[PDB]
């Protein structure tokens, strides 16, 4: 668990702004409109935690 | 006396502070929009009075026309 | 120059200032509310000074357009009848503020704001000379009183009492509003001074009078509709009961004096035996039901129905002794009854109970309270030298001149009134103490001693020299006695 | 030739702006450079700007609304009544668009066609108010009906939205068919469709010699269709279900905008269709039944939206009281009631949308609102009291003047029904106020702060509601001017 | 949590948590007072209208019954709260909220520290 | 000893619609719907309030016939709520309301069957 | 010099003028009755 905290507490100002924008962009989802448009928005890897810190290692 | 300018300014300041309160924000959050609200309230109150006078004049003219039309029934 | 505009705007400024003050500043809220109430009271006292007592014309008249064609407009004016009502309704508010001084930290700003809006609405009721707007401010009092009863009630019963009071007031209000609309359509306007110079066809007097009586009799509970008053009164804060009994019970009689006794002189005469019958049995029944009550606030609340039904005997006598003496009773009742609820509020704040069984022997532990409680017991039982006797006796001499039988029946009211008034005092104050039930005591503090002082001074001042109040009304009540008469 | 179109700039502007917005959204939503941006808020803001600009165009050009009136005579008629009705309709549409902004972000409604369809419905209603023919009236009715049918089922994945859309579709199509049959029977009996011709041919033979079966049945069928449109009982077959199942921002618009334009049509039909006071009886029964049923049905409601729907039905009956009494004062009371009801409905739906962000469904959900948000509870209580008709608030003036109009015509039975219905309404309106302040629920629901647009809308409408009695002169003046201009 | 209930640390309304309080997976029902140096371990429930004395520790899986005062290192029952105390419990939370609101007005939405950062950068070029 | 949370843990056997039997854990004195919410069988956002008037049978459950005798009888409000949302205006005669069932230490091992989900968004 | 003299000269200044009050009341009754008649005649106007 120390690794995600270390990776979060050492980010630069430019990376923090980008991650904040990405977090705001993917905070809420609309599957219906995506299905209408034929696209599938996927969460960027910067907003994905390793499965080894989840309660039971959830892959999905 | 109580002019339209002051009552409009008070209503504008009140609606700004009321909007700020409704959002759990401090009353005097952004002072500049409080000033803008005071100005807009004063302008709206003055325009409302100016429109009310003309509206009453038009209503008087139209009722005069209606009464003149009705009075022709007796001829 | 002191006019009715400033007196009405002062509570507005008081309520607006507290509206935008942080609730953490509890001290500032109380200080500003109390200062606003005191300033309003001084404004009313000044308005008394410059009041002419030789003209029947309405004084300090103010006008503000409401409809575009000036058909109905805000006409504010006072006369010898509604001046003292304004003074009383401005004097009672600071006392109500001072009642909740200690526990104000829990109520918050919504308490003083509600009471100041109440004062704003009641000042305009006694000052309106327009029939429709008198109804608008007549029924605007429900919202602040509904909030006061519900939000700051004692037990879970507050939901039922508020519903019942609101429903009764609505059913009276709309049946009055239909009559007001019919008057507006026929006459053309709703100005009181114009409605007092318009001849009403004899058939329309009975219907309009009945419709007006429907709304007024609820707020001056005659016989069928005094079941909302006890419940709504007991399920109310200490200051809430002062407003309900002090002022809210004076709307019905004031409504009769202003809009019924004059607009229909012929209808009033026909219904005089009807009012005498309802008031005579109400005095007998209510003063008798009071003996078998066990709640402290439910006994005094039944002491108001008998007193307020004695007033409606005076108004309908249509003479100077009757109408003039009925006004003094309401001023006296507004002070005596509201002071008794302060005495009960004193007992309830310390010991959270109201049953008379738990109370006894307080004469040995709370002597200042016993002395003050006894004095208002004497006033409630119509003792000479008190403001109640002057009004009570003037009504009797005003009704004996019209009907000896109704003055006889109303005279048994003071027989029964003196029965429970002293018998309650003997139970609560005199007797032996009961350390099993309650054992810790505290006599009146600085607030309670000071709060009762204006009631003590204002009760004997009206009781030994009522000429100050009487001479300000005779010019206005004599023009009220005769309106359709011309000989 | 170009100056003959000075009478249609407000409609031309809004049509062209809708086209530009549609092009912009369709081009940039399906884009690769910007990664398919969800530009619903962008289109919403630009549509609000377009509404404001066409409001500026329409309001400023007051003397020019009668220009080329002979050329446009067969198409539409523009007058003082149309001017104020259209300005009010644009204001209501702008208010609804302002409320629906937070819906596109938190719930993530990225469909920009919602705003385009709202603008097209607005165009249909603008053409509806100025419509002065049966043909134009029906065409505008159908345009706005389809624009609402499409957006009622916008939540494709929702069970309620699809069913509500289907029910609204079927009911509206049936009502349109009834209205069209009535129009056909009127045309086949008089040979005229223009309102001037249809007034000249009907004003003389006031059923004095005989009752024309075709004209009577056509008038009755048009009245029945219009009553279906406003959902006055027993023509409320699925109105509560449609209101509940529809999206809240959608439900807000259908509760205000269609009623104004439909009432304008009903007035411009009464100017000619007063065939022996036949409609006055139908509207009399409909108003009585609507008041009674709304009052008796909104007490048995536990959800906020169904209660709002039944409140709307009751207020429709209260307004139809004014229709029953045919007089200048009756129409003035009707228009004042429409204005006040629209403002109160906008207030209430803004409040509901404020709490919609936390999935509010039941009245008990808003139980501890007086503790968590002690100013939103006050605003909601003010709106509820205004619905009830308590004297100090603005909702009392409309009911007052409607009762005055009813008593003027001599319909004493309407007054008693209105009084009883008002008592019942005030009872179940203060029932809601009891929940917020007096109850102490064991579990509380915490709502997130509202946004700026709805905050200012609530503030302005709440200041209007409380302080309307102090300065009500402009509304009465404009309403009396509108009522008289219906004939001269 | 050992008890099998969800281990989310939930603090309900009108709950006062004293200083140096260590909460881990504990659930505190509304209108509770937690004393100083109080340790609430995994899966411990504090029922509503209850007061936990200062310096009290309750092991995992322990529960504080509603309307009671508890204290001690192996937290034990002390006495039963009266009506005045259990109605005074939310007033303490309200007063602390008022103090926090007093502290809340000392900070503007944006700090002015970035100006010092810019000055420091200019002292070294960019 | 001391007051353990295990002293008021009520074991239950809740069955999801597809026939799987999972053992849930509840607290004596709280509603059965709350007990079902802990594991996530019933969406918490659908029945956030454990109140009768704030309910349209989102917490409907099927109690076993032998375990329905150790429960309070259904009130009028419970029946009225159950009938309206049944989609057929019929009574299953053995289905209760989750928000109206209060767990008790006498309800150890009660088997409850959760029916299929229903839409509740608007 | 004495409080009574200043007090009575102040009360006499504060009190209102009687003749103008009665004149205002009489003119108010006149104007209100005239406006009432015009408003009733206005209500008498038919819708068509
Ligand atoms: C909700 C708040 C409640 C407050 C109302 C009570 C408080 C009292 C203030 C009411 C107030 C402001 C209205 C506030 C609007 C609210 C804001 C809305 C939202 C804003 C965010 C209007 O009140 C007056 O307006 C008069 C109309 O003029 C009306 O008199 C009737 O009119 C006839 C019709 O033709 C009737 O036939 C007749 O019977 C009456 O004579 C009456 O309405 C009233 O006397 C104060 O008056 C203000 O407007 C005018 C005076 O007129 C003043 O300037 C005027 O300009 C020119 C005229 O354009 C004039 O040439 C000029 O000479 C004059 O100087 C102002 O300086 C100020 O004094
Ligand atoms: C009538 C009774 C008397 C009432 C008192 C009247 C007083 C006069 C009016 C005083 C108004 C005071 C307002 C002060 C100015 C503040 C405006 C700033 C708004 C602003 O900056 O724009 C963005 C939002 O736009 C907005 O917030 C625009 C909201 C506009 C909503 C309504 C639009 C017009 C609709 C037509 C009228 C309503 C219907 C009437 C029939 C801010 O964005 P952000 O930073 O907050 O973040 C994203 C939130 N979106
Ligand atoms: Fe339930």
Do F122 and D245 touch, CB atoms closer than 8 A? yes
Do E20 and E55 touch, CB atoms closer than 8 A? no
What are the φ and ψ backbone dihedral angles of E34, each rounded to 5 degrees?
A: -110, 125
The residue among G40, G46, G47 with the most chain D CBs within 10 A of its CB, best to mutate, is G47
CA-based torsion, G36, G37, G40, G46: positive or negative? negative
As given in the structure block, the two tokens for residue F101 are 């069932």
Using a CB-CB cut-off of 8 Å, the residues of chain G touching C58 are 25
Do D129 and D88 touch, CB atoms closer than 8 A? no
Tell which atom from ligand 1 comes closest to the C-alpha of B15: 21
What is the Cβ-side half-sphere exposure of residue D303, based on CA atoms within 13 angstroms?
17
Do A43 and A18 touch, CB atoms closer than 8 A? no
Do F8 and F29 touch, CB atoms closer than 8 A? yes
Please list the residues that pair with E111 across neighbouring strands.
none
Element (H, E) at C65: strand C59-65
What is the Cβ-side half-sphere exposure of residue D467, based on CA atoms within 13 angstroms?
13
The residue among C128, C135, C126, C122 whose CA lies nearest residue C181 is C135
State in Å: Cα B4 to ligand 1 middle: 7
Helices H / strands E in chain C, number of each:
23, 2
Resolution in Å equals 3.4
CA angle D191/D197/D199 to nearest 5° reads 110
Q: Do D109 and A30 make contact, defined as CB atoms within 8 angstroms?
A: yes
Give the CA distances from residue C487 to residues C133, C403, C476, D74, in Å, rounded to whole numbers and listed in that order: 34, 22, 18, 72
Residue reference for tokens 């968590």: D372
Contact partners for chain A, using 3 or more CB pairs closer than 8 A, are D
Rounded to whole angstroms, how far apart are CA atoms C267 and C249?
A: 24
Q: Do A37 and D36 make contact, defined as CB atoms within 8 angstroms?
A: yes
SS3 D20: helix
Q: Give the distance from residue E102's alpha carbon to the nearest chain F alpha carbon, in angstroms.
A: 33
Rounded to whole angstroms, how far apart are CA atoms D161 and C396?
A: 73
State in Å: Cα B49 to ligand 1 middle: 5
In D187-326, DSSP assigns E strands to none
Do C14 and C116 touch, CB atoms closer than 8 A? yes
As given in the structure block, the two tokens for residue D164 are 């509500």
What are the φ and ψ backbone dihedral angles of F95, each rounded to 5 degrees?
A: -105, 135
Do C144 and C169 touch, CB atoms closer than 8 A? no
Neighbours of C49 (CB within 10 A): 12
Rounded to whole angstroms, how far apart are CA atoms D421 and D293?
A: 9
Rounded to whole angstroms, how far apart are CA atoms C120 and C114?
A: 10
Neighbours of D472 (CB within 10 A): 18
E36 marked as part of a ligand binding site: yes
Q: Which residues are placed with Cβ below 5 angstroms of ligand 3, an ion?
A: F 55, 59, 97, 99
Give the CA distances from residue C242 to residues C99, C221, C252, C351, D408, in Å, rounded to whole numbers and listed in that order: 10, 17, 17, 20, 42
The residue among C223, C325, C304, C313 whose CA lies nearest residue C276 is C313
Rounded to whole angstroms, how far apart are CA atoms F19 and F12?
A: 15
| Mutation pick for ligand 1 pocket among B5, B49, B60 (CB with most ligand atoms within 8 Å) | B49
The residue among C86, C320, C311 whose CA lies nearest residue C217 is C311
Rounded to whole angstroms, how far apart are CA atoms F51 and E105?
A: 38
User: What number of C-beta contacts closer than 8 Å exist between B and C?
Assistant: 4
Sheet of F95-97, strand order: F21-27, F9-15, F110-113, F60-63, F95-97
Element (H, E) at C255: helix C250-259
- Residue B8 Cβ < 6 Å to ligand 1: yes
Rounded to whole angstroms, how far apart are CA atoms F106 and D120?
A: 64
As given in the structure block, the two tokens for residue D15 are 């049509």
Chains E and F touch (3+ CB pairs under 8 A): yes
Please tell me if residue C224 touches chain B, with a CB cutoff of 8 Å: no
What are the φ and ψ backbone dihedral angles of E68, each rounded to 5 degrees?
A: -135, 155
As given in the structure block, the two tokens for residue D28 are 């940039």
The residue among D299, D396, D296, D297 whose CA lies nearest residue D344 is D396
Please tell me if residue G46 touches chain B, with a CB cutoff of 8 Å: yes
Q: Residues of F14-41 as b/e, b for ≥16 C-beta within 10 angstroms?
A: bbeeeeeeeebebbbebbbbbbbbbbeb
Helix axes D278-298, D257-273, angle to 10 degrees: 150
| Mutation pick for ligand 2 pocket among B7, B36, B49, B52 (CB with most ligand atoms within 8 Å) | B36
Rounded to whole angstroms, how far apart are CA atoms C88 and C83?
A: 9
CA-based torsion, F102, F107, F108, F109: positive or negative? negative
Assign 3-state DSSP to chain E and report helix, strand, coil percentages, each to 5. Answer: 25, 25, 50
E20 marked as part of a ligand binding site: no
SS3 C314: helix
CA-based torsion, C230, C232, C236, C241: positive or negative? negative
The string of DSSP letters for B1-59 reads: ---HHHHHHHHHHHHHHHHHHHTT--TTS-HHHHHHHHHHHHHHHHHHHHHHHHHHHHH
Q: Residues of C357-390 as b/e, b for ≥16 C-beta within 10 angstroms?
A: eebbbbbeebeebbebbbbbbbbbbbbeebbbbb
Do E64 and E83 touch, CB atoms closer than 8 A? no
The string of DSSP letters for D103-165 reads: HHHHS----THHHHHHHHHHHHHHHHHTB-BHHHHHHHHHHHHHHHHHHHT--TT-HHHHHHH
Q: Do D449 and B11 make contact, defined as CB atoms within 8 angstroms?
A: no
Q: Do C106 and E91 make contact, defined as CB atoms within 8 angstroms?
A: yes
Please list the residues that pair with E22 across neighbouring strands.
E39
Do D59 and D78 touch, CB atoms closer than 8 A? no
Please tell me if residue C20 touches chain G, with a CB cutoff of 8 Å: no
Using a CB-CB cut-off of 8 Å, the residues of chain B touching D383 are none
- Residue B7 Cβ < 6 Å to ligand 1: yes
Using a CB-CB cut-off of 8 Å, the residues of chain B touching D480 are 59
User: What number of C-beta contacts closer than 8 Å exist between D and F?
Assistant: 45
What is the Cβ-side half-sphere exposure of residue B72, based on CA atoms within 13 angstroms?
5
Q: Which residue of F has its CA nearest to D362?
A: F54
Please list the residues that pair with F61 across neighbouring strands.
F96
Q: Give the distance from residue E105's alpha carbon to the nearest chain C alpha carbon, in angstroms.
A: 11
As given in the structure block, the two tokens for residue C111 are 């308490």
Q: Do F5 and E63 make contact, defined as CB atoms within 8 angstroms?
A: yes
DSSP C274: H
> Where would I find the H helices in C401-473?
404-428, 446-464, 467-470
The domain locations on chain D are 1-488
Rounded to whole angstroms, how far apart are CA atoms D422 and D294?
A: 11
Please tell me if residue F51 touches chain D, with a CB cutoff of 8 Å: yes
Please tell me if residue G42 touches chain B, with a CB cutoff of 8 Å: yes
The residue among C118, C192, C153 whose CA lies nearest residue C480 is C192
Contact partners for chain E, using 3 or more CB pairs closer than 8 A, are C, F
Please tell me if residue C294 touches chain D, with a CB cutoff of 8 Å: no
Please tell me if residue F3 touches chain E, with a CB cutoff of 8 Å: yes
Rounded to whole angstroms, how far apart are CA atoms C144 and C133?
A: 18
E76 marked as part of a ligand binding site: no
Query: Checking DSSP bridges between strand C73-78 and strand C59-65, what pairing results, if any?
Result: antiparallel
DSSP C153: -
Which own/partner contact pairs does E31-37 have at CB distance under 8 Å and 24+ positions apart?
Answer: E31/E86, E31/E89, E31/E90, E31/E93, E32/E89, E33/E89, E33/E92, E35/E71
Q: Do B67 and G46 make contact, defined as CB atoms within 8 angstroms?
A: no
Rounded to whole angstroms, how far apart are CA atoms D324 and D409?
A: 9
Neighbours of F84 (CB within 10 A): 11
SS3 E70: strand
Cα E39 vs. chain centroid, distance in angstroms? 11
């Amino acid at each position: 668990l120390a690794q995600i905290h270390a990776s979060e507490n050492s980010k630069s100002f430019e990376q923090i702004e980008v991650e904040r924008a990405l977090r705001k962009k993917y905070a809420r989802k609309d599957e219906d409109y995506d299905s209408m448009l034929g696209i599938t928005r996927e969460t960027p890897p910067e907003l994905i935690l390793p499965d080894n810190v989840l309660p039971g290692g959830k892959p999905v | 006396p109580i002019s339209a300018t002051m009552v409009g300014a008070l209503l504008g300041l009140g609606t700004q502070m009321y909007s700020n309160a409704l959002r759990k924000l401090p009353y005097m959050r952004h002072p500049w929009e409080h000033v803008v609200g005071m100005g807009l309230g004063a302008v709206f109150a003055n325009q409302l009075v100016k429109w009310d006078v003309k509206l009453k004049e038009d209503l008087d003219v139209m009722l005069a026309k209606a009464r003149a039309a009705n009075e022709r029934r007796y001829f | 120059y002191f006019n009715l505009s400033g007196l009405i705007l002062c509570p507005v400024l008081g309520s607006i200032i507290l509206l935008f003050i942080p609730n953490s500043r509890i001290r500032l809220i109380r200080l500003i509310g109390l200062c606003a109430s005191l300033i309003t009271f001084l404004y009313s006292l000044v308005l008394w000074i410059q009041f002419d007592s030789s003209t029947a014309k309405f004084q300090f008249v103010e006008s503000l357009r409401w409809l575009p064609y000036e058909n109905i407009n805000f006409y504010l004016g006072i006369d010898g009848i509604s001046l003292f009502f304004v003074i009383l309704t401005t004097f009672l508010i600071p006392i109500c503020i001072l009642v909740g001084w200690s526990g104000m930290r829990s109520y918050g700003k919504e308490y003083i704001i509600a009471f100041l809006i109440c004062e704003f609405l009641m000042i305009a009721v006694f000052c309106m000379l327009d029939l429709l707007l008198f109804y608008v401010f007549f029924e605007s009092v429900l919202i602040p009183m509904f909030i006061i009863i519900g939000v700051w009630g004692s037990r879970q019963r507050k939901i039922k009492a508020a519903y019942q009071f609101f429903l009764y007031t609505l059913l009276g209000s709309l049946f009055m509003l239909l009559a007001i609309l019919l008057i507006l359509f026929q006459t053309g306007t709703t100005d009181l001074q114009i409605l007092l110079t318009t001849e009403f066809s004899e058939r329309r007097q009975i219907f309009l009078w009945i419709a007006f009586f429907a709304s007024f009799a609820v707020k001056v509970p005659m016989v069928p509709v005094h079941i909302w008053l006890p419940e709504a009164h007991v399920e109310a804060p200490t200051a809430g009961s002062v407003i309900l009994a002090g002022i809210l019970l004076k709307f019905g009689t004031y409504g009769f004096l202003r809009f019924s006794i004059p607009m229909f002189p012929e209808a009033t005469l026909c219904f005089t035996p009807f009012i005498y019958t309802l008031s005579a049995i109400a005095i007998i029944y209510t003063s008798l039901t009071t003996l078998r009550q066990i709640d402290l606030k439910k006994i005094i609340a039944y002491s108001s129905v008998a007193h307020m039904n004695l007033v409606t005997i005076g108004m309908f006598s249509l003479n100077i002794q009757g109408i003039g003496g009925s006004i003094l009773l309401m001023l006296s009742h507004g002070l005596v009854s509201s002071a008794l609820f302060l005495c009960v509020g004193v007992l309830y704040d310390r010991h959270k109970t109201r049953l008379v069984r738990y109370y006894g022997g307080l004469v040995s532990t709370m002597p200042n309270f016993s002395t003050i409680f006894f004095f208002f017991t004497l006033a409630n039982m119509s003792l000479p030298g008190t403001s109640s006797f002057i009004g009570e006796f003037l009504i009797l001499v005003g009704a004996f001149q019209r009907n000896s039988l109704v003055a006889t029946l109303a005279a048994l009211g003071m027989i029964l009134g003196a029965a429970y008034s002293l018998w309650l005092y003997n139970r609560v104050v005199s007797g032996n103490l009961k350390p099993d039930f309650l054992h810790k005591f505290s006599d009146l503090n600085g607030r309670e001693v000071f709060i009762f002082i204006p009631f003590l001074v204002g009760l004997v001042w009206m009781g030994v020299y009522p000429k100050v109040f009487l001479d300000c009304m005779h010019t206005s009540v004599s023009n009220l006695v005769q309106h359709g008469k011309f000989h | 030739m170009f100056n003959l179109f000075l009478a249609v700039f407000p409609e031309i502007f809004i049509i062209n702006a809708t086209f530009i917005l549609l092009i912009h959204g369709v081009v940039f939503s399906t884009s690769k450079k910007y990664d398919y941006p969800p530009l619903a808020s962008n289109v919403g803001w630009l549509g609000l700007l377009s509404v404001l600009i066409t409001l500026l165009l329409l309001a400023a050009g007051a003397p020019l609304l009668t220009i080329a009136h002979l050329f446009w005579n067969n198409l539409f008629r523009r007058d003082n009544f149309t001017y104020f009705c259209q300005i009010f309709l644009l204001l209501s549409t702008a208010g609804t668009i302002s409320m629906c902004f937070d819906f596109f972000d938190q719930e993530r409604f990225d469909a920009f066609e919602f705003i385009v369809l709202i603008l097209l419905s607005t165009c249909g209603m603008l053409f509806m108010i100025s419509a002065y023919d049966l043909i134009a009236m029906y065409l505008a009715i159908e345009l706005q009906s389809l624009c609402f049918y499409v957006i009622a089922a916008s939540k494709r994945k929702s069970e309620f939205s699809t069913e509500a859309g289907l029910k609204y579709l079927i009911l509206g199509a049936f009502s349109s068919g009834i209205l069209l049959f009535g129009c056909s029977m009127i045309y086949g009996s008089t040979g005229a469709t223009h309102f001037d011709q249809l007034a000249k041919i009907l004003t003389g033979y006031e059923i004095t010699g005989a009752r024309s079966s075709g004209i009577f049945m056509g008038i009755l069928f048009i009245a029945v269709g219009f009553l279906f449109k406003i959902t006055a009982v027993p023509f409320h077959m699925w109105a509560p279900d449609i209101y509940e199942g529809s999206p809240t921002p959608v439900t807000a618009f259908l509760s205000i905008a269609p009623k104004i334009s439909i009432f304008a049509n009903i007035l411009r039909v009464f100017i000619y269709g007063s065939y022996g006071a036949t409609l006055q009886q139908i509207f009399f029964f409909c108003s009585i039944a609507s008041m009674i049923l709304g009052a008796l049905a909104a007490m048995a409601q536990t959800k906020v939206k169904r209660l709002l729907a039944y409140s709307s039905i009751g207020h429709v009956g209260y307004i139809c009281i004014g229709f029953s009494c045919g007089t200048i004062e009756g129409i003035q009371s009707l228009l004042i009631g429409i204005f006040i009801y629209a403002l109160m409905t906008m207030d209430a739906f803004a409040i509901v949308l404020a709490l919609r962000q936390t999935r509010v469904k039941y009245i008990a959900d808003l139980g501890a609102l007086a503790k968590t948000n002690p100013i939103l509870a006050i605003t909601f209580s003010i709106t509820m009291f205004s619905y009830a008709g308590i004297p100090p608030l603005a909702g009392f003036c409309s009911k007052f003047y409607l009762f005055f109009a009813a008593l003027g015509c001599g319909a004493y039975f309407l007054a008693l029904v209105g009084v009883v219905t008002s008592v019942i309404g005030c009872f179940y309106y203060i029932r809601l106020v009891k929940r917020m302040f007096f109850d102490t629920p064991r579990t509380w629901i915490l709502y997130e702060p509202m946004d700026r647009n709805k905050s200012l809308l609530l503030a302005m409408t709440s200041f209007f509601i409380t302080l309307f009695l102090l300065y009500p002169s402009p509304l009465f003046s404009v309403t009396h001017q509108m009522a008289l201009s219906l004939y001269l | 949590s050992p008890t099998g209930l969800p281990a989310q640390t939930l603090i309900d309304r009108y709950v006062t948590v004293g200083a140096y309080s260590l909460l881990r997976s504990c659930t505190i029902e509304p209108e509770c007072i937690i004393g100083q140096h109080s340790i609430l371990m995994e899966g411990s429930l504090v029922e509503t209208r209850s007061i936990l004395e200062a310096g009290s520790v309750l092991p995992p899986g322990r529960r504080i019954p509603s309307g009671e005062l508890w204290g001690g290192n192996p937290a034990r029952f002390i006495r039963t709260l009266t009506n005045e105390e259990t109605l005074e419990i939310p007033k303490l939370a309200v007063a602390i909220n008022h103090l926090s609101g007093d502290y809340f007005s000392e900070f503007l939405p944006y700090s002015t520290i970035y100006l010092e950062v810019e000055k420091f950068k200019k002292s070294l070029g960019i | 000893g001391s007051k353990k949370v295990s002293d008021r843990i009520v074991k239950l056997s809740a069955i999801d619609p597809d026939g799987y039997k999972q053992d849930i854990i509840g607290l004596s004195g709280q509603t059965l719907l709350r007990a079902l919410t802990h594991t996530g069988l019933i969406d918490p956002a659908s029945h956030r309030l454990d109140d009768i008037e704030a309910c349209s049978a989102e917490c409907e459950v099927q109690i076993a016939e032998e375990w329905l005798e150790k429960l309070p009888p259904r009130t009028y409000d419970e029946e009225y709520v159950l009938k309206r949302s049944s989609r057929s205006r019929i009574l299953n005669k053995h289905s209760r309301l989750g928000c109206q069932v209060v767990l008790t230490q006498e309800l150890q091992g009660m088997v409850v069957a959760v029916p299929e989900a229903k839409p509740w968004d608007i | 010099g004495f409080i009574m003299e200043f007090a009575e000269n102040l009360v006499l200044r504060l009190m209102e003028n009687p003749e103008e009050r009665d004149r205002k009341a009489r003119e108010h009754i006149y104007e209100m009755h005239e406006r009432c008649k015009k408003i009733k005649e206005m209500w008498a106007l038919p819708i068509r």
